[PDB]
Design a protein around this ligand. Structure first.
Ligand SMILES: *[C@@H]1O[C@H](CO)[C@@H](O[C@@H]2O[C@H](CO)[C@@H](O)[C@H](O)[C@H]2NC(C)=O)[C@H](O)[C@H]1NC(C)=O
Ligand SMILES: *[C@@H]1O[C@H](CO)[C@@H](O[C@@H]2O[C@H](CO)[C@@H](O)[C@H](O)[C@H]2NC(C)=O)[C@H](O)[C@H]1NC(C)=O
Ligand SMILES: *[C@@H]1O[C@H](CO)[C@@H](O)[C@H](O)[C@H]1NC(C)=O
Lengths: 496, 490
């Protein structure tokens, strides 16, 4: 294990500096006897996933907030955590020298880093691309004889995905999402703007677009990569907006329903890739529950939909209970998955190196999602440059890893450690369980049980004040602790 | 009546061009004869509040969309419509030659224009200012002995407000809102950024800030202007945000509750300005209903609060506005600020016009009694604005050409403001089938009917409106149109 080398860039906290020969890392996981807990702590003052152990005791000395584990109250099982292998992320990673590349990929994907087990893969170009291609730009090729993967896939994304999977001990799930079709399949003949598929569900355009998903899965399978899931379209609502500035494809909820029922579901079902799951929406949660009602009340569509993918950036427009909570209530057997998280307030830089606030927004998001049935998370770009790019629209935003190619250096932002407090300690198949607060409080907290029955609890303090805290496990006893101002803690313990 | 002079700037629709000697206007208002209806139409294709009249028919057959009036299903009474006399708006208006100024003010405030009866007045500087003053910038002036109105009030805002009221036949209501206090009343000692009043409600900082409201009202009254209402603060949630880029003053809901209960309510009530109403929140409706519950469940605060002011951000009404009305049905909701990748000003944008009328209809369907635009006029950059926070406005002034452009937004607003007088009551309007149209119905004080219909689709929609007192209005909603229908009921 090597500790964080901190650097300040004038924001509220530090980044951790990594280069070709040095990156902060953990020892292999090692858990103590019954009656002992492990605690990982990150603070604005600069602690970075620092490990301590202490006792779980029969006597309760705390007189403040008590959080009681309720392991018999069982909620959703976790699919996992990860991020997006965009053209931009791949270009940034591959501009580092190979030993620095390896330390960046280990940070995300190794047991000595934060244990990502999901990668989101754009199907061809998006805003985080240096140009505007699809896999079939040759027109009137309805059988897609001329479908092919460019350099962005075969040189940048695919090789990095292989390397991520080699580093990971956990099985990694790949999730694919398209931004645009070939422009010759669109009403507007453009990669962006207001435009849908030509014609109507079932026709040659819709069948060709469904066939494009299979050709994509075929091409990645030729490179020994298989997908867990695909989404029906990235942000289908974007392609209904006049002037939408980057790659999109517009679907009303009704057009998505009929595309899935008539074309995408049947085409995937008749392929060698019939085991690949299909997620719907892949868009802002303010569109719920309406979008879920329109698609999932049609059995011919609902039979092909595994889950509902949500994006975070317009979360402040619509509360979790009215969107995620009501959707679960109406469709309790259709999982919710967060497929795109994003941060970067119109008066701030795209990238703020060492922003504690942006880190707290990530952990607060993850806890709210877990409290409203969400089973997984994919962050957006795995890495960007210090401008938040490259992006062909200049739609610059923040990322948990910032690469400075000119110094063969990468910086791990507070966002990286806020994500890791979840991703490292919540493996696939973990189940959220009850955690009861004894009184009103300012903390964000969530409890889960590992597949082996061991406990994990995350506690976020977004306040400036230290909060004395007891955690009770009815089977073990009392963990007496403190949640410092501007801190995040992950607690782990055996229950027998 | 003079028709629109259209000009394209290459976007979806046209502006109407006005100058020192020409501006589009209406003939004095008339009412359609009993048994007939009036229709005013604006289209993307270029029609601007064009008047036609049709017969009300005794019978109707067919499968087509029917909207039925429910005159006995009564909802909110309307306070009115208008916009904001910012420093930026007044500076732009007064840079035109005097005759062009008069045609601009007539466009908004005349019965021959669109009949505005609201003006929102910033208390000192905001982002739509060219500098960052307050009325009391002398440090630690707790007695406000150096309170004074600068030239932005005495030379720009106040003279234009007097001229607006002179042109309006309808009584105009003035609404006042502060962005920042003096910096010496603030924890951060700056006009912008994260910062709230120093100390605690009841103390000398909070009493001084409340007496600043009375000094403002006193100074405007010395200029023979009286206010209908003040808000407790513009966007109090903004001053809770680090780096907030322009004038702000942070309040949590609890701080707003306690400032109103301890300081602003009693101070206003003990003044010669006790008839002035107080609106709370003056912020994004996503803060409802929580903010309303915090303030209005305290009787010590509730007894001072007439209304809840909401801001729109145009670019879920039931859960915010609807739930608030349900909890607090005797506390009016009022939309006090609305504005619209793309460039700040898009001359001739039909899309931005449709955002305005869609907003007003959604608001009217959820208990809102009034709708206040932001800047009455900006320049073609969307300024001036000291932080470059440029936005669009229904009227764009081209000082170099002594010209102003009436945007589609102006006509989308006018389809409501011109035809919905103060005291109009929203009534029920039921669709016979699901449809892409936005519609709302109201009754004028005098009993007559008004219906606005907006079509945000490309498809013409045949439709009938049924009023059981008179019969059937057979009409069409063309794609990318807005219509206002008027008829007498007896
Ligand atoms: C990569 O980062 C590491 C750690 O910051 C740097 O290693 C340090 O090098 C200095 C001076 O060159 C030594 O005296 C320190 O003891 C080193 N720390 C450790 C733990 O080794 C290394 O210099 C960096 N590489 C480059 C090219 O700057
Ligand atoms: C103010 O605008 C009006 C209306 O466009 C201009 O008056 C028109 O001028 C044109 C071109 O000279 C004539 O052909 C029209 O017949 C005029 N219409 C009317 C009703 O007069 C006027 O020239 C503009 N003033 C300035 C200073 O540009
Ligand atoms: C404050 O008021 C005093 C007394 O009326 C006056 O002499 C002085 O000029 C004022 N200060 C400012 C900055 O206007």
């Amino acid at each position: 294990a090597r500790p964080c080398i901190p650097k300040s860039f004038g924001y509220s906290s530090v980044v951790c500096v990594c280069n070709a020969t040095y990156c902060d890392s953990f020892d292999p996981p090692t858990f103590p006897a019954l009656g002992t807990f492990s605690r990982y702590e990150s603070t604005r003052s600069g602690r970075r996933m620092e490990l301590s152990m202490g006792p779980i005791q029969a006597n309760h000395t705390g007189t403040g907030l008590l959080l009681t584990l309720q392991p018999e109250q069982k909620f959703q099982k976790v699919k996992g955590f990860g991020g997006a292998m965009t053209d931009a992320a791949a270009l940034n990673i591959l501009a580092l020298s190979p030993p620095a590349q390896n330390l960046l990929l280990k940070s995300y994907f190794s047991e000595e880093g934060i244990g990502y087990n999901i990668i989101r893969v754009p199907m061809a170009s998006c805003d985080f691309s240096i140009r505007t291609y699809t896999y079939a730009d040759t027109p009137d090729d309805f059988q897609l004889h001329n479908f092919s993967l460019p350099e962005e896939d075969t040189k940048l994304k695919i090789p990095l995905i292989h390397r991520a999977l080699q580093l990971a001990q956990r099985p990694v799930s790949l999730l694919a999402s398209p931004w645009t079709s070939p422009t010759w399949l669109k009403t507007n003949g453009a990669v962006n703007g207001k435009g849908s598929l030509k014609g109507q569900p079932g026709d040659i355009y819709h069948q060709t677009w469904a066939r494009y998903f299979v050709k994509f899965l075929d091409a990645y399978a030729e490179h020994k990569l298989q997908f867990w899931a695909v989404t029906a379209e990235n942000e289908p609502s974007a392609g209904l907006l006049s002037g939408y500035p980057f790659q999109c494809l517009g679907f009303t909820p009704e057009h998505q329903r009929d595309f899935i029922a008539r074309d995408l579901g049947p085409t995937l079902a008749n392929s060698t890739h019939h085991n690949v799951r299909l997620l719907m929406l892949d868009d802002q949660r303010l569109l719920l529950p309406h979008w879920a009602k329109v698609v999932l009340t049609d059995p011919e569509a609902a039979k092909y939909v595994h889950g509902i993918a949500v994006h975070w950036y317009l979360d402040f427009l619509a509360p979790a209970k009215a969107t995620l909570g009501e959707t679960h209530r109406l469709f309790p057997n259709t999982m919710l998955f967060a497929s795109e998280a994003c941060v970067g307030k119109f008066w701030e830089q795209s990238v703020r190196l060492g922003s504690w606030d942006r880190g707290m927004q990530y952990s607060h998001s993850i806890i709210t999602n877990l409290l409203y049935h969400v089973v997984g998370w994919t962050d957006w770009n795995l890495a960007l440059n210090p401008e938040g790019g490259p992006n062909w629209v200049r739609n610059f935003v923040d990322s948990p890893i910032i690469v400075d190619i000119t110094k063969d250096t990468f910086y791990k932002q507070p966002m990286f450690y806020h994500l890791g407090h979840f991703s490292k300690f919540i493996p696939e198949g973990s189940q959220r369980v009850g955690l009861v607060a004894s009184q009103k409080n300012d903390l964000d907290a969530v409890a889960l049980m590992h597949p082996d029955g061991s406990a994990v609890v995350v506690v976020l303090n977004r306040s400036s004040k230290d909060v004395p805290l007891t955690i009770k496990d009815p089977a073990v006893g009392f963990l007496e602790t403190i949640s410092p101002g501007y801190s995040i803690h992950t607690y782990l313990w055996h229950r027998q």
